[PDB]
Design a protein around this nucleic acid. Structure first.
Ligand SMILES: [Mg+2]
Ligand SMILES: [Zn+2]
Ligand SMILES: [Zn+2]
Ligand SMILES: [Zn+2]
Ligand SMILES: [Zn+2]
Lengths: 87, 85, 112, 98, 180, 171, 491, 96, 156, 45
RNA sequence: UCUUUUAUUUUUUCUG
C-alpha cells in the first residue's frame, strides 16, 4: 500500500539534517567510495573515504535520499541536498 | 597425530627441556605421547604471554609408580609504567 | 497529582546530596511510570507485565515464565524493540536506524 | 543350577531335586514312572515366596494351596508329559497357554 | 531456491498449513489468481485477460518499444511475418533464451485474428457479454461450433449464458475469423 | 491462459555499479533474471511488458553493505495450465509409452490407459505412429488434448493429457 | 555460514509465538529417536536411530550430515522426535492447564459460562488476552456445576437451555506434578482425559480465552511428541583424549527415552494400572526435570556426580543464561583491555595505544586506487612491523595470512580485495571503562601508536570515565567497517 | 572482552546503531540460517551445493529466505523449539 | 484382599525376596504357637524396583521388614482389588630454522637468539637476554653449531 | 531519551553519600511502589 | 598451497 507515502508537500518534519542522519550519510558514502563508487567532486589530493564524503556533503552533491519513517509506519522522502545541514 | 605449535628442537632425547635454555610463547617444555588402540602427542605448551628461562626440572615417580615431572621457569620482571606499587 | 508528587519526591532525593539532574529526565521517568492508569512500578510486577514485545519482556528478569506465557497466548512481536533487534541481530531503530538511506535515481541521472 | 518343577512349580536346587525329588509331586511322579529331572525345567520367571497354602489367595489362584510352604514360580516354561497330564486332569499349563 | 518475484497482496499466511483451494477450471483458482487485483497506485480492479491474437500483438509491441529503447540508448503472407518477427527476436535477445523462440513459433502457427481493429471489436463484444476474463479468453482462443460442444469444453459454464446467446457470439466470432 | 499480471522483483546492486548507466545495467539484469524462468507458484513468466515504463523506485541501501536493493514494479504476461482444459498442440516425439504434445512453451504427456481403443501403435512406421479406423496420428500433426493434472518441478511444469470426450482428437 | 547462497538476503521484522502441534513435530523432524544409546556402540559413531543420530546433524568434523551435506560450520541442526506412549504435561503450562480446566467443563469440554451471563459478557469484552483470561478464570472459579439451562434476560422465570452436560465440576488442586480433582471422590486426573477434553474444546471456546486456533491450540499444551534437539544444542565435552562426556541435555534425553521405552513395553505387556501409573509418573518427572530443574516443593534431580542437571530454565534464566549472558551482551573480537595511564601531552580526543595491541588488532579496509600504494607498502611490511597487515581477503573469500606466506613481495594487490591492516594513528576506536554507568563512560578516541604497555589517555577525560591510575583497566574496541568508523567519529 | 549489558546500554544511549550491530553480529558471532515463509523455522534442509531448499511439513520450495542472526540467537531459538515455544520468523507486516 | 506393593531398589528383587523368605523360615522355626501373619511374598521381573507382600496389617509388615537392609518400607500402597487379576494374569508379554644465531650491526648487537620462523628475506629471532622477537635478514647474521664455539656465516 | 534519562538518574545514585529517609534506599522505594512506608510524612499548611 | 589444538563445571582468591 502506497497510501502511507507522504508527498513532498504537507511534510511535517524538520528540514534540518539530524546528527544521526549526517552520521549515516557520511558513513554510507565513505563505504561506497571505499568500494569504488563514482566520485561527484574533484579529488584535491584527498584519499580518506570519510573526508571525501565530508567534502561531498559540504558541496551538497550526494545522490542519496533519507526515507524518514514516521511512527505509524508512514514516511517522508527527504532529498539530502534539500536537507539543510548546519549543526 | 596432533603436535603443538611450539618448537620441539629444544626438547632433549628424554623429551624434557633442560635448565638454562629459553622457552617462550607456546614453546613446548614437556614432550608427551598418549598411545591408545599414531603417537598422538598430548604435550603441555608454555603460556603465550610468558617468557623466561627454565630454572629447574625434577623427575620422580608418583605413588602409583607413574612418572611425575615438575618444571620451574624463571624470568626477571623490571618495573615498567603499567606496574602497580 | 500522583505523577507530579512523585516527581517532587524524586527531585528531593536527587537534590538531597546536592546532585543536580536535569528536569526532563525526571519528567520522562515519571511519565513512563504513570503512562498507564496507575503508577506502574519499575519492578517484576510493574512495567514487565505490560503488552510490549515478548522478547523485550523476557530480556528482563522473568525470562522463561514470560516466554511460556507468550507461547501459550500466541503473542506476536513486531520487532520494533531495541531488545528484539539486538537479539535477532538487526540494526535497531536507535538513533540512525529510525530511517533508511535511498539512492537518488533522478538526481544521479540528471547530473550526468 | 536352580531348576523349577513344571507341575506344582516348586523351585529349588537341582541338587536338592536329586536328593529328595519333588516333595509335593512325589506320589504322582512315582505313579507315572517319570523322574523329576524331565518334569523340572531350568527356565522360570515370576518367583513366589510362599508361606500360607491354606490362607494365601495368591496361592488359591496359582493352585499351590494344597502344597507346602516354599518356593514357587508363576511361569515355568515347557510342556508337561502326557503320562501325568492325563492323570491330573485338573492341571492347567503354567506358561499361560490353554 | 533463487531470487523470486514478490507479491502485493499482503497475505494472511500466518502458519496456516497447505489449505490452497484445489486447482481447477471451475473458478476454483489459486489465492493469487482472483477476480480482484491491486493496481500499481493501490486501487482494486477486475482481472484483465486476453486472447492469443492479443498475445501476439502485445508481444509485438513490447518488442518494438524495446527496440526503440535500445536504439535511443545507442544514439547517445505467413513467411514474411515469420522472418521479420524472427529477426526481431534475434536482434533483441542474445539467443540463449530458447523459450521465447518456442512461444513465438507456437503463437505464430496458432492465432485467429491478425488485425488490431478486429481485435478491438472482439474485446468490445466480449465486454458487452461481460463474462469472466478467463472465460472470454478461452472463448476467443479455442475454436467452437455448437453450444453443447462449448458447454462440454467448459463444464463450469453451465449456469452462465443462454444457448441462443452462446450461438450468437459463436457465429459472430466465426464471421470475424480472418482468412490469413 | 496468458494472463497479464502484476509482478515485482528485488535486485541487489553492488556499490561499484552505481553510475550513469544505473538504468540500463539494471534493465539488462532484470531481463536476464526474468526471461526463461518458471515457478509452480506463479506459473510461467513469458515476457515482461512496458519495458520503457518500468518504474525503478528509490532503492534501499542495505545496512551492513552498500549494496542497494531495488524493488522494481512491472507488468508481465503469465501462463499457468489448469486441470481440466482443452488445448491443441503438436507432437514432438512418439514412443510405445506415449507421444509428447507441445502446448505453448511446455509439453503435455498422454498415457495409453486414457486413449481410445481404436488407436493402436505400430512400430513399422518411420517415425513410429498410431493408427485408427478413421484417422492417423504422426509427429507432424496437430492434436487436441484434455489436461487433467499438473505437476511442478524445480524449473518446469508438466501436464497429463487424455482424449475421451467429444471433439478431442486430431484435426 | 560463509558461502554463497542463491536465496534472497533478508532481515526479520516479526517474531510469532505459539506451540508445536504433534503433527507439526512429526512432519518437521528428520529422524525418530528410539535407542537411548548415544554412540560408542561397536566403535561406530553414527548410531542410527539413537541420540546424536547423524541425520540430526553432524557430531564432529566429517563433512557429511546425511541431511544437508554441508558440515558442522554450516549445519543449523535438525531435530528428531520421540512419540511418548502417553501424553505428559508441560511444566511451564501446569498452571495454565489448571486454569483452563477450571475454566471449562471436564466432561463436555465447554466453558462453565456463556454470553448469557452479564459478568461473562463484561469479561469477554476485555480486548487484551491476559486480562480477559484472568476475568474468565475469576468468574468460573465461583461456579462449580454445569447448568444445563440458565435464566433468560427477557424473563427470569423462563430458562433457556445453554447446552452441555449436567455433571458437577470438581475442585482441581496441584499435588506435585499431577492435578487432583475432588468431586468427596478425590482422584488424580489422567493426562489422557485432560488431553481428551482439551481437543473436545471448541474453536470459539478457546478463541474467547487467550488462545489462537492457528498458533497455539489448547491441546498442543501437552507433550505427545517431544522434539529432540540436534547435536549443536547438546555438544559433548572431552575430559581427555579418551574420556568423553555427553552433555547434560543429552543425558536427560537418554533418561527420558529409557523411561518411554519402559512405559511403552509395560503398556504392551500386562498393565496392572498402578505400574502404568508409576511409570507415567516417572516419565513426567523426567520430562519435568529435563525442561525445568527448579520445581518448588519437590526433590531436585541429581546427575551421576551429585550436582543439579543443567536444564532448560537453568540455561535460559540467570545472568549467565542465553538471553542475559549470551544475547543482551556477549564476547567481542577485535578488542583489547589493559591498564590505563595519564599523559597530559596527548590531545583531548586522542588515546595512546600500546604497540603490541596495535600489531594485534586490525581493521579491514577495501582496496581502492587512492590507497593502492599505501596498502602495497603495508602488505610488504607484513604483520611483523606496526604499519602492515595480518591477512588479505581475496574476492573469492580465500584468505591468505602474511606470516605463513613467504611470497608477500610477489602477492599483488587488486581492487575489491580487503586487507586487515593494523590500527594506525588517527583511527577512531571506542574506549570503555568497565563500570559503564552512563553514556559518557564510552567514547571514541583517535589512536596514537606509542611503544609501552599501557593505554595512555589525556587526563581531563578521567572525569566521565570516573577513572584513576591505581590499577584501573579499560577496553579499546576497534571498528571493523568504514560505516562504523564514521558513526563513531560523528556520534 | 564481554560487551556487557551496561556497554550495550551506553551504546543505545549514544545512538551508534551501526556500531552496535557490527559489535553484536559481525564481531561476536554471525550465522546465516535459512527459513521458509509458511512456518519460518530454522529446519530448512538447504543443500547450497545443489541450490535446493526444502521444508518438510509445509511442502514449499520457493518462499525460502536467508537471514543472518547471531549463533547465540539461533541456539536460543533451537532451545525454545525444543522447549515447545515457537520463535517464528516472518516477513509480511499485517498489523502495520 | 490385602496385597500391598512396596518400593525397593531395582535389580535386587530376587535377593530381597530371598532374604525375606530365609528370615521367615528362621523366625517360624524360632517362635512357638504364635507365628506371624504374612501370607505370601513375590515380585515380577517385568516390574522392577518393587515387591508385593500379602499381609493383614501395616504394623505386621513393618515388624517383619525390620532388620532387612535396602528395603524402602516407607513407600507402601494397598493395591485395589480390581488391579490384582490383571497383575497376576499368568501371561504377561631450510637449515636456518631452530638454530642459535648472533646479530652484528644493529642496536641489539651481541644478542644471541633462536630462529623460530622465517618469512623469506628476513628471519625472526628471540633475544637470548630480553623477552622480544626481532626481524632481521639472515645473510647478515652468523650461525653456530648447537654448542658454543666455531662461528660460520650464512653458508651452511 | 528513555535510556538517557535512566542513566542520568542512575549515575548520581552510585555517588550518593528535623528526619526523613533519603539516598539509595529512598530512591529504591520510589522506584518500587510500596504500600508500606518506613517514614511516612504529611505536610499540612 | 594453504590448514592445524588450547576441555567442562564446581569452588576459592583477590583486581578495579
Ligand atoms: Mg581506580
Ligand atoms: Zn512337582
Ligand atoms: Zn544438516
Ligand atoms: Zn458440561
Ligand atoms: Zn515451512
Amino acid at each position: 500500500l502506497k497510501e502511507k507515502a507522504i508527498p513532498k508537500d504537507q511534510r511535517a518534519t524538520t528540514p534540518y539534517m539530524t546528527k544521526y542522519e549526517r552520521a549515516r550519510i557520511l558513513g554510507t558514502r565513505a563505504l561506497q567510495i571505499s568500494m569504488n563508487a563514482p566520485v561527484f567532486v574533484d579529488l584535491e589530493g584527498e584519499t580518506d573515504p570519510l573526508r571525501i564524503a565530508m567534502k561531498e556533503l559540504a558541496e551538497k552533491k550526494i545522490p542519496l535520499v533519507i526515507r524518514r519513517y514516521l511512527p505509524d509506519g508512514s514516511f517522508e522522502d527527504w532529498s539530502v541536498e534539500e536537507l539543510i545541514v548546519d549543526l | 597425530l596432533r603436535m603443538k605449535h611450539g618448537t620441539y628442537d629444544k626438547l632433549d632425547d628424554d623429551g624434557l627441556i633442560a635448565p638454562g635454555v629459553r622457552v617462550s610463547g607456546e614453546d613446548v617444555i614437556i614432550g608427551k605421547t598418549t598411545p591408545i588402540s599414531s603417537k598422538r602427542d598430548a604435550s603441555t605448551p608454555l603460556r603465550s604471554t610468558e617468557n623466561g628461562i627454565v630454572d629447574q626440572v625434577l623427575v620422580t615417580t608418583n605413588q602409583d609408580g607413574l612418572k611425575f615431572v615438575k618444571v620451574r621457569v624463571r624470568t626477571t620482571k623490571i618495573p615498567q609504567i603499567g606496574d602497580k606499587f | 497529582a500522583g505523577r507530579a508528587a512523585l516527581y517532587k519526591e524524586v527531585y528531593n532525593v536527587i537534590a538531597s546530596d546536592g546532585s543536580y539532574v536535569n528536569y526532563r529526565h525526571m519528567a520522562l521517568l515519571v511519565d513512563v511510570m504513570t503512562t498507564q492508569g496507575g503508577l506502574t512500578s519499575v519492578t517484576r510486577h510493574g512495567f514487565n507485565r505490560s503488552n510490549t514485545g515478548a522478547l523485550m519482556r523476557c530480556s528482563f528478569e522473568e525470562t522463561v515464565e514470560i516466554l511460556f506465557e507468550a507461547g501459550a497466548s500466541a503473542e506476536l512481536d513486531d520487532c520494533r524493540g531495541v531488545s528484539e533487534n539486538v537479539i535477532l541481530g538487526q540494526m535497531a531503530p536507535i538513533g540512525t536506524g529510525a530511517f533508511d538511506v535511498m539512492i537518488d535515481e533522478e538526481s544521479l541521472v540528471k547530473y550526468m | 543350577s536352580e531348576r523349577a518343577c513344571m507341575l506344582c512349580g516348586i523351585v529349588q536346587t537341582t541338587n536338592e531335586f536329586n536328593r529328595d525329588g519333588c516333595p509335593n509331586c512325589q506320589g504322582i511322579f512315582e505313579e507315572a514312572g517319570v523322574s523329576t529331572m524331565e518334569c523340572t525345567s531350568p527356565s522360570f520367571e515370576g518367583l513366589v515366596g510362599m508361606c500360607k497354602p491354606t490362607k494365601s489367595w495368591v496361592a488359591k489362584w496359582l493352585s499351590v494351596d494344597h502344597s507346602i510352604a516354599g518356593m514357587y514360580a508363576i511361569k515355568v516354561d515347557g510342556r508337561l508329559p502326557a503320562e501325568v497330564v492325563e492323570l491330573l486332569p485338573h492341571y492347567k499349563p503354567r506358561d499361560g497357554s490353554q | 531456491m533463487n531470487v523470486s518475484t514478490s507479491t502485493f497482496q499482503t497475505r494472511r499466511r500466518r502458519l496456516k498449513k497447505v489449505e490452497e483451494e484445489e486447482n481447477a477450471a471451475t473458478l476454483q483458482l489459486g489465492q493469487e489468481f482472483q477476480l480482484k487485483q491491486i493496481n500499481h497506485q493501490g486501487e482494486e480492479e477486475e482481472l484483465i485477460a486476453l486472447n492469443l491474437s492479443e498475445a501476439r500483438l502485445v508481444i509485438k509491441e513490447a518488442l518494438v518499444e524495446r527496440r526503440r529503447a535500445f536504439k535511443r540508448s545507442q544514439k547517445k503472407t505467413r513467411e514474411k511475418e515469420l522472418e521479420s518477427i524472427d529477426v526481431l527476436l534475434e536482434q533483441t535477445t542474445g539467443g540463449n533464451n530458447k523459450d521465447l523462440k518456442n512461444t513465438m513459433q507456437y503463437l505464430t502457427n496458432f492465432s485467429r485474428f491478425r488485425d488490431q481493429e478486429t481485435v478491438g471489436a472482439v474485446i468490445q463484444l466480449l465486454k458487452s457479454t461481460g463474462l469472466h476474463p478467463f472465460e472470454v479468453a478461452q472463448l476467443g482462443s479455442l475454436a467452437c461450433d455448437t453450444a453443447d460442444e462449448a458447454k462440454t469444453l467448459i463444464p463450469s459454464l453451465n449456469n452462465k449464458i443462454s444457448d441462443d446467446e452462446l450461438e450468437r457470439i459463436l457465429k459472430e466470432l466465426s464471421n470475424l475469423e480472418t482468412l490469413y | 491462459m496468458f494472463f497479464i499480471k502484476d509482478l515485482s522483483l528485488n535486485i541487489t546492486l553492488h556499490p561499484s555499479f552505481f553510475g550513469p548507466r544505473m538504468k540500463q545495467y539494471l534493465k539488462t539484469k532484470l531481463l536476464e533474471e526474468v526471461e526463461g524462468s518458471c515457478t509452480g507458484k506463479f506459473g510461467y513468466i513469458l515476457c515482461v511488458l512496458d519495458y520503457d515504463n518500468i518504474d525503478i523506485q528509490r532503492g534501499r541501501i542495505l545496512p551492513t553493505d552498500g549494496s542497494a536493493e531495488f524493488n522494481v514494479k512491472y507488468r508481465a504476461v503469465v501462463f499457468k495450465p489448469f486441470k481440466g482444459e482443452v488445448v491443441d498442440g503438436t507432437v514432438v516425439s512418439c514412443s510405445q509409452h506415449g507421444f509428447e504434445v507441445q502446448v505453448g512453451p511446455m509439453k503435455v504427456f498422454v498415457t495409453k490407459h486414457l486413449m481410445p481403443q481404436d488407436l493402436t501403435f505400430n512400430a513399422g512406421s518411420n517415425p513410429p505412429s498410431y493408427q485408427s479406423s478413421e484417422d492417423v496420428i504422426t509427429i507432424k500433426s496437430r492434436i487436441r488434448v484434455k489436461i487433467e493434472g499438473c505437476i511442478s518441478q524445480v524449473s518446469s511444469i508438466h501436464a497429463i493429457g487424455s482424449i475421451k470426450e467429444d471433439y478431442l482428437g486430431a484435426i | 555460514g560463509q558461502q554463497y547462497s542463491s536465496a534472497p538476503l533478508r532481515t526479520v521484522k516479526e517474531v510469532q509465538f505459539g506451540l508445536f502441534s504433534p503433527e507439526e513435530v512429526r512432519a518437521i523432524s528428520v529422524a525418530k529417536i528410539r535407542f537411548p544409546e548415544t554412540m560408542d556402540e561397536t566403535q561406530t559413531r553414527a548410531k542410527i536411530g539413537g541420540l546424536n543420530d547423524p541425520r540430526l546433524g553432524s557430531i564432529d568434523r566429517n563433512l557429511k550430515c546425511q541431511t544437508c551435506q554441508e558440515g558442522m560450520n554450516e549445519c543449523p541442526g535438525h531435530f528428531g522426535h520421540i512419540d511418548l506412549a502417553k501424553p505428559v504435561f508441560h511444566v511451564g503450562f501446569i498452571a495454565k492447564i489448571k486454569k483452563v480446566c477450571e475454566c471449562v467443563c471436564m466432561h463436555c469440554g465447554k466453558l462453565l459460562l456463556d454470553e448469557h451471563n452479564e459478568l461473562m459478557r463484561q469479561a469477554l469484552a476485555i480486548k487484551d488476552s491476559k486480562k480477559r483470561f484472568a476475568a474468565i478464570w475469576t468468574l468460573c472459579k465461583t461456579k462449580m456445576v454445569c447448568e444445563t439451562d440458565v435464566p433468560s434476560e427477557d424473563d427470569p422465570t423462563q430458562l433457556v437451555s445453554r447446552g452441555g452436560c449436567g455433571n458437577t465440576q470438581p475442585t482441581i488442586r496441584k499435588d506435585g506434578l499431577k492435578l487432583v480433582g475432588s468431586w468427596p471422590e478425590l482422584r488424580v486426573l489422567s493426562t489422557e482425559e485432560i488431553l481428551n477434553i482439551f481437543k473436545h474444546i471448541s474453536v470459539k471456546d478457546f478463541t474467547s480465552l487467550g488462545f489462537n486456533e492457528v498458533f497455539s491450540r489448547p491441546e498442543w499444551m501437552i507433550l505427545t511428541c517431544l522434539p529432540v534437539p540436534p547435536p549443536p544444542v547438546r555438544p559433548s565435552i572431552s575430559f581427555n583424549e579418551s574420556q568423553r562426556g555427553e552433555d547434560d541435555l543429552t543425558f536427560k534425553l537418554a533418561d527420558i527415552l529409557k523411561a518411554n521405552i519402559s512405559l511403552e513395553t509395560l503398556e504392551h505387556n500386562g498393565a496392572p494400572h498402578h505400574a502404568i501409573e508409576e511409570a507415567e509418573s516417572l516419565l513426567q518427572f523426567h520430562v519435568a526435570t529435563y525442561m525445568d530443574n527448579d520445581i518448588a516443593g519437590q526433590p531436585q534431580a541429581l546427575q551421576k556426580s551429585g550436582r543439579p542437571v543443567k536444564s532448560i530454565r537453568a540455561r535460559l534464566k540467570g545472568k549467565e543464561g542465553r538471553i542475559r549472558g549470551n544475547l543482551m551482551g556477549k564476547r567481542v573480537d577485535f578488542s583489547a583491555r589493559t591498564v590505563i595511564s595519564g599523559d597530559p601531552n596527548l590531545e583531548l580526543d586522542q588515546v595512546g595505544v600500546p604497540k603490541s595491541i596495535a600489531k594485534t588488532l586490525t581493521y579491514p579496509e577495501v582496496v581502492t586506487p587512492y590507497n593502492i600504494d599505501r596498502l602495497t607498502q603495508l602488505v610488504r611490511n607484513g604483520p611483523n612491523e606496526h604499519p602492515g597487515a595480518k591477512y588479505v581477503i581475496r574476492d573469492s573469500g580465500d584468505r591468505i595470512d602474511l606470516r605463513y606466506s613467504k611470497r608477500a613481495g610477489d602477492i599483488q594487490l587488486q581492487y575489491g580485495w580487503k586487507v586487515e591492516r593494523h590500527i594506525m594513528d588517527n583511527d577512531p576506536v571506542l574506549f570503555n571503562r568497565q563500570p559503564s554507568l552512563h553514556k559518557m563512560s564510552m567514547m571514541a578516541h583517535r589512536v596514537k601508536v606509542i611503544p609501552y604497555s599501557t593505554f595512555r589517555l589525556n587526563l581531563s577525560v578521567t572525569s566521565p570515565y570516573n577513572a584513576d591510575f591505581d590499577g584501573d583497566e579499560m577496553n579499546l574496541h576497534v571498528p571493523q567497517s568504514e560505516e562504523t568508523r564514521a558513526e563513531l567519529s560523528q556520534l | 572482552l564481554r560487551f556487557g549489558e551496561m556497554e550495550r546500554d551506553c551504546m543505545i544511549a549514544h545512538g551508534a546503531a551501526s556500531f552496535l550491530k557490527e559489535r553484536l553480529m559481525e564481531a561476536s558471532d554471525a550465522f546465516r540460517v535459512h527459513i521458509c515463509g509458511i512456518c519460518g523455522l530454522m529446519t530448512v534442509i538447504a543443500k547450497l551445493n545443489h541450490n535446493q531448499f526444502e521444508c518438510k511439513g509445509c511442502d514449499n520450495k520457493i518462499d525460502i529466505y536467508q537471514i543472518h542472526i547471531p549463533y547465540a540467537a539461533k541456539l536460543l531459538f533451537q532451545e525454545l523449539m525444543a522447549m515447545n515455544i515457537t520463535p517464528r520468523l516472518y516477513t509480511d507486516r499485517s498489523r502495520d | 484382599a490385602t496385597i500391598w506393593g512396596v518400593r525397593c531398589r531395582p535389580g535386587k528383587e530376587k535377593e530381597l525376596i530371598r532374604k525375606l523368605l530365609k528370615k521367615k523360615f528362621n523366625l517360624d522355626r524360632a517362635m512357638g504357637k504364635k507365628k506371624l501373619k504374612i501370607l505370601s511374598i513375590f515380585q515380577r521381573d517385568n516390574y522392577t524396583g518393587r515387591i508385593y507382600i500379602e499381609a493383614p496389617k501395616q504394623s505386621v509388615i513393618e515388624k517383619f521388614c525390620n532388620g532387612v537392609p535396602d528395603i524402602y518400607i516407607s513407600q507402601k500402597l494397598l493395591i485395589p482389588v480390581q488391579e490384582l487379576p490383571l497383575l497376576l494374569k499368568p501371561n504377561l508379554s631450510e637449515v636456518a630454522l631452530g638454530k642459535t644465531v648472533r646479530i652484528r650491526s644493529a642496536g641489539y648487537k651481541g644478542q644471541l637468539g633462536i630462529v623460530k620462523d622465517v618469512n623469506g628475506d628476513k628471519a625472526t629471532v628471540e633475544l637470548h637476554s630480553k623477552n622480544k622477537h626481532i626481524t632481521i635478514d639472515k645473510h647478515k647474521l652468523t650461525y653456530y653449531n648447537r654448542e658454543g664455539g666455531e662461528g660460520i656465516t650464512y653458508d651452511e | 531519551v528513555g535510556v538517557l534519562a535512566a542513566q542520568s538518574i542512575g549515575e548520581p545514585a552510585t555517588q550518593m553519600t528535623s528526619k526523613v529517609t533519603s539516598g539509595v534506599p529512598r530512591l529504591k522505594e520510589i522506584l518500587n511502589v510500596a504500600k508500606n512506608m518506613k517514614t511516612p510524612s504529611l505536610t499540612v499548611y
